[PDB]
């Protein structure tokens, strides 16, 4: 049957050109999905290198962290010890300052000893005169 | 042939939604390609942004590390001095004890000296009274 | 027509097996779709990831260059304190020195006038024996 034939190879050409559609997008598709998994892997590689570098500066971060609380102690430890010092120098100078007036009243003290000496010495060789020569 | 027609008519409906299957898969498939190709370009600025951070932190932690180095170094320095000062401090403060012993011993010595210079003369004093009394 | 029939069957034959390619090949890429959407997933957590701990890091970052800076500012406050202190104990030691020979000047000079006392108590006392002898 002629009708039969002719509305089947009508048929027969439109089946084959949308396999052909579909072969052509599968083919696109194909592709793009070996891009992607090429781009997923270049990321894994990124991300994973990204952890490692984390974790590298973490532990620095930590020895940081340690150092700086070390640090502050010993600077506060010192801080303390300053204070300490600056209280005994204050007393030492106090000190001093009283030893200077000691030796300046002792030193006033024993050059009016000296003087005093020397005077009644003088007194009294003076007296012992007279009364030698008012014997003889 | 009637009976090839009618077995060609089938085969063509088959082939017909065969070709039509795959064509709908490969569009749904084309459709999830793009939306991961979508995914991985997002992924891409955060992997980049994250690179970027992480220099920037890598770097600031350098500065911290050389700080902490640095400031313990200069707290270590400190501490050797401090020291130094306590010892120096103490030897002032046991100098400055022997001052006072000094001091003391020595005000002792000149009010005795002031003492018996008085005592002296009066006794002289005395002495030459009776004597001019009996010369005269 | 016989003719027509004969390749309208052959035509048929390619297009099934051109359809069966098509719907292999869309059900292929339909998995490798599945596959990189399942990896993406997993590259979403670990980015995120990374940037929760990137925060982390950069605060405590901040915490320590601040750390830094405050102890290096409290060391340089002691460093010019103990700078201060070695002036003042270095004065002190001068001060010290000073008294040290200021108390032995004066050690010799109220020893000089206790022997002067004594000398010139015993020539009064011996020059009184002879003229008290003389009157009688
Ligand atoms: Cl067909
Ligand atoms: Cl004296
Ligand atoms: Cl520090
Ligand atoms: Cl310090
Ligand atoms: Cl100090
Ligand atoms: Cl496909
Ligand atoms: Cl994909
Ligand atoms: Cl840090």
Same mark, same amino acid.
């Given at each position: 049957?002629?009708?039969?034939?002719?509305?089947?190879?009508?048929?027969?050409?439109?089946?084959?050109?949308?396999?052909?559609?579909?072969?052509?997008?599968?083919?696109? %598709? #194909?592709?793009? +999905?070996? @891009?992607? =998994? /090429?781009? $997923?892997?270049?990321?894994? *590689?990124? &991300?994973?290198? !990204?952890?490692?570098?984390?974790?590298?500066?973490?532990?620095?971060?930590?020895?940081?962290?340690?150092?700086?609380?070390? %640090? #502050?102690?010993? +600077?506060? @430890?010192? =801080? /303390?010890? $300053?204070?300490?010092?600056? *209280?005994? &120098?204050?007393? !030492?100078?106090?000190?001093?300052?009283?030893?200077?007036?000691?030796?300046?009243?002792?030193?006033?003290?024993?050059?009016? %000893?000296?003087?005093? +000496?020397? @005077?009644?010495? /003088?007194?009294?060789?003076?007296?012992?005169?007279?009364?030698?020569?008012?014997?003889?």
């Amino acid at each position: 049957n002629t009708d039969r034939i002719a509305t089947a190879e009508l048929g027969i050409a439109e089946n084959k050109k949308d396999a052909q559609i579909a072969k052509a997008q599968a083919n696109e %598709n #194909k592709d793009g +999905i070996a @891009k992607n =998994q /090429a781009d $997923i892997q270049l990321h894994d *590689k990124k &991300i994973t290198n !990204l952890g490692i570098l984390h974790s590298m500066v973490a532990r620095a971060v930590g020895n940081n962290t340690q150092g700086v609380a070390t %640090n #502050k102690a010993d +600077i506060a @430890k010192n =801080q /303390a010890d $300053i204070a300490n010092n600056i *209280k005994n &120098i204050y007393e !030492l100078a106090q000190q001093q300052d009283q030893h200077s007036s000691d030796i300046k009243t002792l030193a006033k003290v024993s050059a009016a %000893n000296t003087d005093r +000496i020397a @005077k009644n010495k /003088a007194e009294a060789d003076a007296s012992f005169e007279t009364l030698t020569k008012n014997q003889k």
